[PDB]
Scaffold this active site. Structure first.
Site, mmCIF file in Angstrom:
data_model
loop_
_atom_site.group_PDB
_atom_site.id
_atom_site.type_symbol
_atom_site.label_atom_id
_atom_site.label_comp_id
_atom_site.label_asym_id
_atom_site.label_seq_id
_atom_site.Cartn_x
_atom_site.Cartn_y
_atom_site.Cartn_z
ATOM 1 C CG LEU A 37 25.807 -8.366 -82.198
ATOM 2 C CD1 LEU A 37 25.876 -9.342 -83.363
ATOM 3 C CD2 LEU A 37 26.225 -9.053 -80.904
ATOM 4 C CG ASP A 38 31.092 -4.987 -79.012
ATOM 5 O OD1 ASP A 38 31.255 -6.009 -78.314
ATOM 6 O OD2 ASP A 38 30.703 -3.896 -78.547
#
Ligand SMILES: CCCCCCCCCCCCCCCCCC(=O)OC[C@H](COP(=O)([O-])OCC(O)COP(=O)([O-])OC[C@@H](COC(=O)CCCCCCCCCCCCCCCCC)OC(=O)CCCCCCCCCCCCCCCCC)OC(=O)CCCCCCCCCCCCCCCCC
Ligand SMILES: CCCCCCCCCCCCCCCCCC(=O)OC[C@H](COP(=O)(O)OCCN)OC(=O)CCCCCCCCCCCCCCCCC
Ligand code: SF4
Ligand code: SF4
Ligand code: SF4
Lengths: 77, 186, 114, 209, 118, 182
Positions: A37-38
């Site tokens: 995930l960013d």
């Protein structure tokens, strides 16, 4: 404290979260490496999790959270 | 009279310096006004007195003014008594116009005289400063006496040369009279 | 090519990274209030994307002082939006709705003209 | 003997010269240079850090008593490396005099706020941040004071177009005013007001390297 | 005793001679801590003596103001309350040291943006 | 430009009459509406209530129109504060971008029929600040304008002449007479 109730909530937040797959949705999974995930997305999840649990996690408390294991343990407080 | 709380030096006037007396002769005098609306009484006499004055209103448009010959109003391009336009497209007016409200394009006329093929004033940009008429070396552009040229459309407030020239003919008599009575000062 | 300078708000990129995330928190918390208190077409999910879209604009920024300034300005808008000093028009200004798309392909631009 | 030329006020010039030196000794750490302007006005060029110290010194010292802060003007000069200069105009009622303190800062480097010394600079500093983009550390609440809400950029930098980038119009589709890229019916017509012949020879050789 | 100071929000002072004497006494102690060669120490130390002695020399406030000028006794106190703040604050800045920041090149050049020929 | 009639030529012209629709209506129904249309216009014409906007230095000359020298009130013009009761808005001053949404809203809240007057160069076309980075180039960009009064500031008589133009514009509305044809 009601660990299974806590565990299902924490993992519910992730499944309820979008832009994620329920695959590899284990306690040991790593958010930024395994889940991939960013760092913005990472903030969206944990700070969404505060909504379901109704807690309020400061940044210095929030920074530690790297895995559902870190969250679920931290959630126990 | 009561005394002053603060002594006053030279060349200075105080507005609230006098103290309040405490003699019964004065306290009663203040009390009487405070008690029978005495201060407000004279205020009512003054306002009623103004009923009995000629009101200063003017019955516009039948009566109007006064103005002075220096009044700055609508623009107009004058011309010589021969009929030839005064403007020679020197473009001093364009360069000095603070609002950049003037646009001029000049061309060698057929007879070979320096003249304008274009002269536009954007009256919604002009400020009626009057620098254009001071800078014109031949008095071509002047701010005529007219101040009654409100329109119902924005486009009609952009004057081109033909509109400006028409004003210089409609208003010619009065402009020539203002310049004569005012040029010596200028 | 390095020089000594006075810091703006932070001393380390990590602290700067820490401040920027807080600004994301406060905005992300605030979207539900902005939708209610502004008569604008956009919904929370649309806005919450706009927050993501623009934090991405400054993707390649590296200097901490520049990141500080973006966070100073970024915070200023939020206070002006946490308050309703910004009017209905200003909030929708973040979308550029009035401006219609300008095609990018060469053939379309050529035909449309410069 | 010549009426057109303005007569210099020597007595006022004399006091400012000596008191100008006086400041130079009291504040060696900060006062870079002191100069008496041609208008018989004193200017004190300080380092960026010496803002709060120097301002405090002028306000509190017996001899200075520059109690009254009048202005804070910002000047943009893209040529210089520290393009932004900030000028304080102080007035001393007790001594009936004016002094100017100048300092220089970059686009990014903050400038120590002087609300403390003179809290009349609460808004003046707000204006400077808004107009030029100079940040003031320790300010109570820095915030735009003049420009529109959400106005992007800092209009008074010399590197900013005169008309700005965006206009406003009302769009009846959206039932609100919308911003569009600028589009002027008539361009701002420049005029090249540059003289080809130097007129002030006294400043030709001024400011040696 | 003055009836009124004449300035809004400035109260007449009781025993201005004492209040000034304490303040001038405090200043000389704060200034003393500064290095001897500091020019500020030399000036205030010289100055405050000239103010301090006049405070003790005269016992009538009206005579005191003439002897010192520089405003009413109330303002004299107001002044004195400042150099405590300045002198105290300035023991932290240490302004007497050398120039903290050497000026950049062309940073005080006017008019700007001219070619300089070497 | 159409010039005025000469005296001798004008010495024959019939008296103008009050109504701009004349008394030449063919039917009774049309004629009654025409006369009834005058009654509306006579009403709205008589009492035109500005809003007291007063933005900038045209605003000062918008006070002297209410001053005793010219006395706007003689014409039924009465200043009012709330945009609900106000009938006309006199945008007098430089409408900057920060103001622009506020004028739009205030104008919208005004109930119909609403007429706008533009005073001075600032509100007409941006005036002296036409090229500024924070000026709306004329209020007609934002709200419809019904009369443009040039000047900077317009003289008090100049605005008075503007107001009378608005009365004449009101006087010739065909709100009813055009319903009949519709
Ligand atoms: C209280 C209100 C009154 C205030 C005092 C002033 C009123 C009088 C006045 O101003 O006279 C002007 C007028 C002078 O002007 P004028 O040069 O002769 O010509 C008038 C217009 O130019 C020529 O008129 P026009 O037809 O071209 O334009 C007016 C238009 C519309 O009339 C109006 O302008 C008024 C508003 C609309 C009509 C109102 C009724 C609505 C519908 C009627 C149809 C049904 O048509 C008319 O109605 C006029 C016809 C007269 C009979 C009225 C019907 O005076 C007269 O000529 C007549 C004297 C006034 C009548 C007094 C009768 C007393 C009876 C005792 C009861
Ligand atoms: C207090 C004093 C009050 C004085 C009142 C004077 C009233 C005069 C009446 C004239 C109508 C005024 C209201 C109005 O403006 O209605 C206009 C309407 C036409 O409007 P419309 O064609 O629909 O325009 C397009 C909109 N999209 O019109 C219509 O649609 C129908 C028009 C038919 C004619 C109606 C005439 C009514 C006469 C009323 C007299 C009242 C006397 C008592 C007050
Ligand atoms: S009056 Fe002034 S602003 Fe108007 S056109 Fe003349 S020079 Fe330009
Ligand atoms: S200054 Fe006079 S002569 Fe020159 S261009 Fe203007 S109007 Fe013509
Ligand atoms: S048009 Fe002229 S008088 Fe009116 S507000 Fe603008 S500058 Fe002032």
């Amino acid at each position: 404290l009601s660990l299974k109730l806590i565990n299902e909530r924490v993992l519910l937040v992730l499944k309820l979260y979008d832009k994620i797959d329920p695959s590899k949705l284990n306690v040991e999974s790593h958010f930024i490496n395994d889940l991939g995930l960013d760092s913005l997305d990472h903030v969206e999840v944990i700070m969404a999790m505060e909504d379901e649990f109704g807690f309020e996690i400061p940044d210095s408390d929030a920074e530690k959270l790297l895995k559902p294991a870190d969250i679920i343990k931290y959630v126990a407080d | 009279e009561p005394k002053d709380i603060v002594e006053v030096p030279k060349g200075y006037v105080y507005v609230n310096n006098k103290e309040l007396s405490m003699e019964f002769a004065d306290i009663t005098d203040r009390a009487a006004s405070t008690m029978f609306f005495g201060e407000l009484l004279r205020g009512f006499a003054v306002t009623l007195a103004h009923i009995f004055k000629e009101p200063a209103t003017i019955n516009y448009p039948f009566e109007k003014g006064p103005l002075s010959p220096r009044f700055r109003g609508e623009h107009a391009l004058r011309r010589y008594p021969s009929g030839e336009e005064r403007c020679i497209a020197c473009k001093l007016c364009e360069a000095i116009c603070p609002a950049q409200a003037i646009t001029i394009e000049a061309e060698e006329r057929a007879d070979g005289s320096r003249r304008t093929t274009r002269y536009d004033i954007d009256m919604t940009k002009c400020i009626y400063c009057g620098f254009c008429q001071e800078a014109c070396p031949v008095d071509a552009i002047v701010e005529g006496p007219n101040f009654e040229f409100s329109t119902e459309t924005h486009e009609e407030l952009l004057y081109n040369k033909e509109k400006l020239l028409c004003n210089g003919d409609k208003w010619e008599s009065e402009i020539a009279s203002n310049l004569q009575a005012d040029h010596l000062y200028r | 090519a390095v020089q000594q300078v006075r810091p703006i708000l932070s001393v380390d990129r990590e602290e700067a990274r820490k401040r920027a995330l807080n600004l994301y928190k406060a905005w992300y918390r605030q979207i539900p209030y902005i939708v209610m208190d502004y008569d604008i077409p956009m919904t929370v999910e649309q806005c919450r994307d706009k927050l993501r879209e623009e934090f991405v604009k400054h993707r390649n920024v590296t200097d901490i002082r520049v990141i500080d300034m973006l966070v100073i300005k970024g915070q200023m808008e939020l206070k002006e939006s946490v308050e309703i000093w910004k009017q209905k028009g200003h909030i929708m200004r973040y979308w550029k709705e009035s401006q219609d798309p300008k095609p990018t392909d060469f053939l379309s631009k050529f035909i449309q003209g410069v | 003997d010549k009426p057109t030329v303005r007569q210099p006020d020597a007595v006022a010039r004399s006091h400012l010269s000596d008191f100008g030196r006086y400041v130079a000794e009291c504040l060696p750490k900060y006062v870079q240079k002191v100069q008496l302007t041609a208008g018989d006005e004193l200017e004190v060029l300080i380092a960026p850090e010496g803002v709060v110290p120097v301002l405090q010194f002028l306000k509190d010292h017996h001899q200075a008593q520059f109690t009254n802060l009048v202005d804070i003007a910002g000047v943009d000069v893209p040529c210089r490396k520290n393009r932004f200069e900030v000028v304080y105009n102080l007035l001393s009622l007790r001594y009936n005099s004016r002094i100017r303190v100048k300092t220089y800062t970059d686009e990014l480097t903050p400038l120590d706020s002087a609300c403390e010394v003179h809290k009349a600079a609460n808004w003046y500093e707000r204006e400077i941040w808004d107009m030029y983009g100079v940040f003031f550390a320790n300010h109570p609440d820095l915030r735009r004071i003049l420009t529109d809400y959400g106005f992007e950029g800092h209009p008074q930098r010399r590197d900013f177009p005169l008309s700005g980038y965006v206009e406003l119009r009302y769009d009846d589709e959206k039932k609100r005013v919308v911003c569009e890229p600028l589009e002027l019916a008539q361009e701002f017509r420049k005029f090249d007001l540059s003289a080809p012949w130097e007129q002030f020879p006294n400043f030709r050789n001024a400011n040696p390297p | 005793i003055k009836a009124s100071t004449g300035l809004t929000g400035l109260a007449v002072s009781t025993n201005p001679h004492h209040t000034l004497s304490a303040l001038y006494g405090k200043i000389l102690r704060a200034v003393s801590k500064m290095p001897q060669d500091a020019s500020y120490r030399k000036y205030t130390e010289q100055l405050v003596k000239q103010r301090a002695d006049s405070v003790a020399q005269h016992k009538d406030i009206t005579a005191l103001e003439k002897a010192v000028g520089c405003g009413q006794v109330e303002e004299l106190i107001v002044q004195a309350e400042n150099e405590l703040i300045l002198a105290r604050k300035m023991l932290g800045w240490k302004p007497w040291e050398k120039l903290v920041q050497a000026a950049p090149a062309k940073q005080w050049d006017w008019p700007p943006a001219q070619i300089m020929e070497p | 430009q159409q010039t005025l009639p000469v005296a001798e030529v004008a010495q024959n012209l019939p008296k103008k009459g009050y109504s701009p629709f004349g008394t030449k209506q063919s039917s009774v129904a049309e004629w009654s509406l025409a006369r009834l249309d005058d009654l509306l216009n006579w009403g709205r014409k008589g009492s035109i209530w500005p809003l007291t906007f007063g933005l900038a230095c045209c605003a000062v000359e918008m006070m002297h129109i209410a001053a005793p020298r010219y006395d706007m009130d003689r014409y039924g013009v009465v200043f009012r504060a709330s945009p609900r009761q106000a009938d006309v808005i006199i945008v007098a001053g430089t409408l900057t971008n920060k103001m622009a949404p506020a004028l739009r809203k205030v104008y919208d809240q005004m109930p119909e029929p609403r007429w706008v007057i533009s005073m001075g160069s600032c509100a007409n076309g941006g005036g002296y600040y036409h090229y500024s980075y924070s000026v709306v180039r004329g209020c007609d960009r934002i709200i419809p304008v019904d009369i443009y009064v040039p000047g900077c500031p317009p003289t008090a008589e100049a605005l008075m002449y503007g107001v009378l133009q608005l009365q004449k514009k009101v006087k010739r509305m065909k709100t009813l007479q055009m319903w009949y044809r519709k």
